Design a protein around this ligand. Structure first.
Ligand SMILES: Cc1cc2nc3c(=O)[nH]c(=O)nc-3n(C[C@H](O)[C@H](O)[C@H](O)COP(=O)(O)OP(=O)(O)OC[C@H]3O[C@@H](n4cnc5c(N)ncnc54)[C@H](O)[C@@H]3O)c2cc1C
Length: 512
């Protein structure tokens, strides 16, 4: 054994995995990332307007009290360069880089049934052994590059938001953006005013609410820092972990005039999760409540966008409101004389030539730059791109050929000593609280094993099948996926995994 534990990922999930196992448990551990710096997705995604979905004071670690007091809280939400600097500062303080090997992908990890440890091989064919594998792998980008005929003949700049280069300049250029998910909304709002002309190619109009990202006064920051203990106590006690007053008020239980008042209030403060969960308690459950949320945003769209035909094209049709987008002036962009909206569901892209994008009606859209706002992959994907083989050498690709499944979102049957952080079938909540929860739980279980010299931990097939049903029970009660995620929220997730730890890890296969 080279190591007690090998960590893959130096993002949020891997940086804390490392800190927890090396320093609070005195294990020998080494971590690996392909990146040249810590930060994970905040290192790779440097596109214009990249901004957190959670507010600054909560998109961070809770476990280091003196870091909370030290933290710079510039704006209500935190931009990508600032998150990256924060993660780097976490590394400086807790001396984590000496145990991270950068520029090092992992090609494969094979479980050794004979000695109960993992054989892990880099892409440069270096081989390390470790009792425990910790996978903190995040989500890769969704669509590689758009499967469009002739895209490779394009002779202008072709930029993917997940490999955004440095020194992109926009002035004097005709620019095109494929994609209008969260990443596309941020790019487009960021660059519309910098280009000579912007063409947006929207496949599918989405609902978006104001983010309301404002500067924080020194007294604003003091309010938070003086009460940080209560703030975090409210995170652990909530469903989402976003600092919201999570409503229980049914949408249809009030007058139209009161209902308009409550949505307006969330709209003025900003934030997608606020609009969806702080206004009423059933927007994501009741079809009739959801339509009320839909119409409020549709009306706002039609009041902000002055040209009714452009506004009509922006209006989501039939689509229900699920998974919340926010923006810093998105719908306003479309009143600008230098912006055009192309509905590419009505008028698909058929071809890309050397100087242009051409749609089904024959029109050539001439472009100097084409931006592919990639989105994000189901993941699953990040795991299916490492050769992971457990017992009798089944690959993870085979074991999940028909969808991912796990125990509590962290352990996979047939894959012992492997613990996933922020993996499939996990909760839907603010990420750092989820990551912290899972890392402390994993670390506690590895300590139990250390004290009781057990060297093979594994989830049964039945713990995993019970977990798959717990998720489908909760999920088939929601408008979402109308599954593969636990949606009882953060507090109920922490119960689930407390019961297991308090019942000598019922469902697990402690061995030796
Ligand atoms: C612009 C943007 C804004 C976001 N805002 C929010 C938000 O407000 N709230 C929220 O909850 N979530 C948000 N997210 C989601 C975000 O992914 C999570 O918050 C969190 O950062 C995930 O951290 P992680 O360490 O688990 O994953 P990552 O940060 O992606 O870490 C994955 C790392 O592991 C490395 N890795 C993977 N595989 C391999 C391999 N085979 N070999 C070597 N190395 C490897 C990767 O290169 C990567 O560096 C946002 C994402 C983006 C892009």
């Amino acid at each position: 054994m080279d190591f007690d534990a090998i960590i893959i990922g130096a993002g949020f999930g891997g940086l804390y995995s490392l800190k927890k196992l090396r320093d609070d448990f005195n294990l020998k551990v080494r971590a690996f990332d392909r990146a040249t710096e810590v930060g994970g997705t905040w290192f790779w995604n440097q596109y214009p307007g990249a901004l957190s979905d959670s507010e600054t004071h909560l998109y961070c670690y809770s476990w280091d009290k003196e870091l909370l007091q030290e933290m710079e809280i510039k704006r209500k939400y935190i931009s990508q360069p600032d998150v990256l600097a924060y993660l780097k500062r976490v590394a400086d303080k807790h001396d984590l880089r000496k145990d991270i090997q950068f520029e090092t992908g992992i090609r494969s990890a094979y479980f050794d049934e004979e000695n109960s440890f993992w054989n892990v091989t880099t892409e440069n064919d270096e081989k390390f052994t470790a009792r425990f594998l910790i996978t903190a792998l995040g989500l890769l980008a969704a669509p590689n590059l758009p499967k469009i005929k002739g895209i490779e003949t394009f002779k202008g700049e072709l930029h993917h938001t997940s490999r955004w280069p440095k020194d992109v300049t926009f002035s004097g250029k005709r620019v095109g953006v494929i994609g209008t998910g969260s990443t596309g909304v941020q790019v487009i709002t960021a660059i519309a005013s910098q280009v000579k002309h912007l063409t947006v190619f929207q496949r599918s109009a989405q609902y978006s609410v104001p983010i309301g990202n404002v500067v924080m006064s020194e007294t604003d920051v003091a309010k938070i820092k003086e009460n940080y203990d209560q703030i975090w106590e409210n995170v652990w006690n909530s469903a989402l972990g976003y600092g919201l007053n999570e409503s229980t008020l049914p949408t249809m239980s009030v007058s139209a005039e009161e209902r308009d008042k409550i949505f307006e209030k969330a709209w003025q403060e900003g934030g997608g999760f606020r609009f969806m969960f702080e206004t009423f308690g059933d927007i994501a459950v009741d079809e009739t409540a959801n339509i009320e949320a839909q119409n409020f945003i549709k009306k706002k769209i039609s009041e902000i966008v002055k040209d009714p035909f452009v506004a009509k094209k922006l209006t989501p049709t039939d689509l229900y409101a699920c998974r919340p987008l926010c923006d810093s002036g998105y719908y306003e962009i479309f009143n600008r004389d230098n912006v055009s909206l192309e509905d590419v569901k009505a008028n698909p892209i058929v071809e890309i030539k050397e100087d242009c994008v051409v749609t089904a009606d024959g029109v050539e859209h001439k472009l100097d730059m084409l931006i592919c706002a990639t989105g994000f992959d189901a993941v699953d994907g990040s795991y299916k791109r490492i050769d992971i083989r457990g017992k009798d050498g089944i690959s993870i690709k085979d074991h999940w050929k028909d969808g991912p499944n796990s125990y509590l979102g962290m352990m996979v049957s047939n894959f012992p000593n492997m613990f996933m952080v922020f993996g499939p079938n996990g909760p839907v909540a603010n990420s750092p609280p989820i990551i912290e929860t899972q890392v402390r739980w994993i670390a506690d279980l590895i300590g139990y094993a250390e004290d009781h010299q057990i060297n093979q931990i594994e989830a049964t097939k039945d713990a995993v099948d019970n977990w798959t049903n717990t998720c489908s029970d909760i999920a088939n009660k929601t408008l979402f996926a109308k599954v593969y995620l636990y949606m009882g929220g953060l507090k109920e997730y922490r119960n689930q995994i407390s019961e297991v730890s308090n019942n000598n890890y019922k469902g697990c296969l402690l061995k030796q």
